[PDB]
Swiss-Prot record:
Residues 1-129 form the C-type lysozyme domain. One of its GO terms (cellular component) is extracellular space. The active site is at 35, 52. Keywords: Allergen, Antimicrobial, Bacteriolytic enzyme, Disulfide bond, Glycosidase, Hydrolase, Secreted, Signal. The keyword Secreted applies. It comes from the Eukaryota. Monomer. Lysozyme C is capable of both hydrolysis and transglycosylation; it also shows a slight esterase activity. It acts rapidly on both peptide-substituted and unsubstituted peptidoglycan, and slowly on chitin oligosaccharides. This is Lysozyme C. Its main location: secreted. Pfam families: Lys. The gene is LYZ. The lineage of its organism: Eukaryota, Metazoa, Chordata, Craniata, Vertebrata. It is found in: Secreted.
Length: 129
């Protein structure tokens, strides 16, 4: 599923991501925009053989099991396929764990490079939320 901007904002809020660990909803929308272009089915292989999955491009090196990332962990206790669902529940639960791990949203390199410090409220501008 390819979400729209306000539709994704709405879904994130419903799943309690808005202001989670102090990160406003526009930060989460912005991260999703640049990690996956709002496509739940996004996958990208990393040079180290891990893969990033879903709307927030969660990495199999630590957070989910894909069966093909040797030496990896599965700290969200989920198959990485669950992260490609049209329903964002698994991605959201996992992102909560990720953003609580110590470095906040810096875990998401696109968020650090493209969202951090910017006018992130623009991402929820005009949305009925
Ligand atoms: Cl957009
Ligand atoms: Cl594995
Ligand atoms: Cl959803
Ligand atoms: Cl980047």
């Amino acid at each position: 599923k390819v979400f729209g901007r306000c539709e994704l904002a709405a879904a994130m809020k419903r799943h309690g991501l808005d202001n989670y660990r102090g990160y406003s909803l526009g930060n989460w929308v912005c991260a999703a925009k640049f990690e996956s272009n709002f496509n739940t089915q996004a996958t990208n292989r990393n040079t180290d053989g891990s893969t990033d999955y879903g709307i927030l491009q969660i990495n199999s090196r630590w957070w989910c099991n894909d069966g093909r990332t040797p030496g990896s962990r599965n700290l969200c206790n989920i198959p990485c396929s669950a992260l490609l669902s049209s329903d964002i529940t698994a991605s959201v639960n996992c992102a909560k764990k990720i953003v609580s791990d110590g470095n906040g949203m810096n875990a998401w390199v696109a968020w650090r490079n493209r969202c951090k410090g910017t006018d992130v409220q623009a991402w929820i501008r005009g949305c009925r939320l």
